[PDB]
Amino acid sequence: SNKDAALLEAARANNMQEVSRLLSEGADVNAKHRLGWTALMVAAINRNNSVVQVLLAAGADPNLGDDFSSVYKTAKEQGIHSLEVLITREDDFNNRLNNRASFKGCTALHYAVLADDYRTVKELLDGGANPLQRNEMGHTPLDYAREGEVMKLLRTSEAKYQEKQR
């Protein structure tokens, strides 16, 4: 309800104390914004490592995909005005992303890689996030990475996936 919306706002704010309280009051740990993203997603894109750990410890699914596509596609798909979609995505999710691109199926790991924050990536991988999972465009978290530790962290986890699969 409003408690699910309060969860997402606290996730954006990195307010771990508030996230834990709302979770204790029955907020859905996998609640989705009307435009299609989760609390773990909005925490990941904003480098909110503190809240990511709280969400993972409370059972958040790290492999869900954003139902948000682009301002253009989501405006038509859902029948909202494009300016409202753009403002909402910039204000309630992130304003440094190119939201003209397509994000459908992006997981929290996708967003954590786009933010170039090794700590959030490492925590998401320890929470069971699939580094081989593709978005609607077919891109994995690797495909969004850049030369650095984030790639290396991904490469070893991807290597361990082949090793530890069943």
Author numbering: 132 to 297
Paper text:
For functional analysis of the ANK domain, we determined the crystal structure of the ANK domain at 2.1 Å resolution. The ANK domain of CLPB contains 4 AMs and a unique insertion (consisting of 2 short helices) between AM2 and AM3. The isoform 1 of CLPB differs from the isoform 2 exactly in this region, with 30 residues more in this insertion sequence. (A) X-ray crystallography structure and AlphaFold predicted model of the ANK domain. The RMSD between these 2 structures is 2.6 Å. Fitting of the crystal structure of the ANK domain reveals that the insertion exactly locates in the inner surface of the ANK layers. Interestingly, the insertion contains 2 patches of hydrophobic residues, implying a potential role in substrate binding. Our data showed that the ANK domain is indispensable for the disaggregase activity of CLPB, and a deletion of the unique insertion in the ANK domain resulted in more than 50% reduction on the disaggregase activity. Next, we analyzed the dimer interface of the ANK domain by docking the ANK models into the density maps of the double-heptamer and double-hexamer. For the ANK dimer in the double-hexamer, 2 regions of the ANK domain contribute to the dimerization, the AM1/2 motifs and the insertion.
The human AAA+ ATPase CLPB (SKD3) is a protein disaggregase in the mitochondrial intermembrane space (IMS) and functions to promote the solubilization of various mitochondrial proteins. Unlike canonical AAA+ proteins, CLPB contains a unique ankyrin repeat domain (ANK) at its N-terminus. The N-terminus of CLPB has a mitochondrial targeting signal (MTS), followed by an ankyrin repeat (ANK) domain, and ends with a C-terminal NBD. The ANK domain is not only responsible for maintaining the higher-order assembly but also essential for the disaggregase activity.
